[PDB]
Amino acid sequence: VNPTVFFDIAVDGEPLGRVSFELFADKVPKTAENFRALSTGEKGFGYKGSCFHRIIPGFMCQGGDFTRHNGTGGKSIYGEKFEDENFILKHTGPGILSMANAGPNTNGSQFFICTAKTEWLDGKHVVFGKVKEGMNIVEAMERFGSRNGKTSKKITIADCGQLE
């Protein structure tokens, strides 16, 4: 019942590959539905064409700022910044999909993919999904990041949507 979404990633415009996610709608339905919606674009806005603007190897890949392309923007499907739904699920290792924010109850559209166990984020960021297929594509993306998070090539979501 949990929905599956995919990203088709490109690097300076050249295809790299597809990452797919399981979204834990059974446990965090409001947060999973936001990400699902933004990935299909069915509200008229969303992730297609946006970039991963902050990539720190061994740490995480952050994206979803489809409004300002640099970490200052993005918006949810709810007309404002939704609440932290719950912190049931933990940051247990690579592939975890989790919400970025600006403090308690400030979720918008930005998210990150963990490339390592990041327990210090437990209780701070809402985990709502996991990479299903294509972790190797995340690993290839990670190599274009840097110590301060600046990417050496443009990493884009060339296409995205819902699978199955």
Curated annotation (Swiss-Prot):
Keywords carried by this UniProt record: Acetylation, Apoptosis, Cytoplasm, Glycoprotein, Host-virus interaction, Isomerase, Isopeptide bond, Nucleus, Phosphoprotein, Rotamase, Secreted, Ubl conjugation
Annotated consequence of substituting F59A: Loss of ability to stimulate MAPK/ERK phosphorylation
Effect upon mutating T106A: No effect on peptidyl-prolyl cis-trans isomerase activity. Reduced interaction with BSG/CD147 and ability to induce leukocyte chemotaxis
Catalytic activity: [protein]-peptidylproline (omega=180) = [protein]-peptidylproline (omega=0)
Any one GO cellular component localisation term in the record: extracellular exosome
Positions carrying Phosphothreonine: T92
Effect on the protein of changing K124Q: Acetylation-mimetic mutant; no effect on its interaction with TARDBP
Cell location: Cytoplasm; Secreted; Nucleus
Quaternary data: Interacts with protein phosphatase PPP3CA/calcineurin A. Interacts with PRPF19 isoform 2 (via N-terminus). Interacts with isoform 2 of BSG/CD147. Interacts with FOXO1; the interaction promotes FOXO1 dephosphorylation, nuclear accumulation and transcriptional activity. Interacts with integrin ITGA2B:ITGB3; the interaction is ROS and peptidyl-prolyl cis-trans isomerase (PPIase) activity-dependent and is increased in the presence of thrombin. Interacts with MAP3K5. (Microbial infection) Interacts with HIV-1 capsid protein.
PTM sites of type N6-acetyllysine: K27, K43, K75, K81, K124, K130, K132
Protein's UniProt name: Peptidyl-prolyl cis-trans isomerase A
N-acetylvaline, modified sites: V1
Disulfide bonds: none
UniProt lineage: Eukaryota, Metazoa, Chordata, Craniata, Vertebrata
Modified residues annotated as Phosphoserine in this record: S76
Endpoints of the signal sequence: none
Organism: Homo sapiens (Human)
Cross-link (Glycyl lysine isopeptide (Lys-Gly) (interchain with G-Cter in SUMO2)): K27, K81
Result, substituting W120H: No effect on peptidyl-prolyl cis-trans isomerase activity
Listed InterPro entries: Cyclophilin-like_dom_sf (IPR029000), Cyclophilin-type_PPIase (IPR024936), Cyclophilin-type_PPIase_CS (IPR020892), Cyclophilin-type_PPIase_dom (IPR002130)
GO molecular function, one term: unfolded protein binding
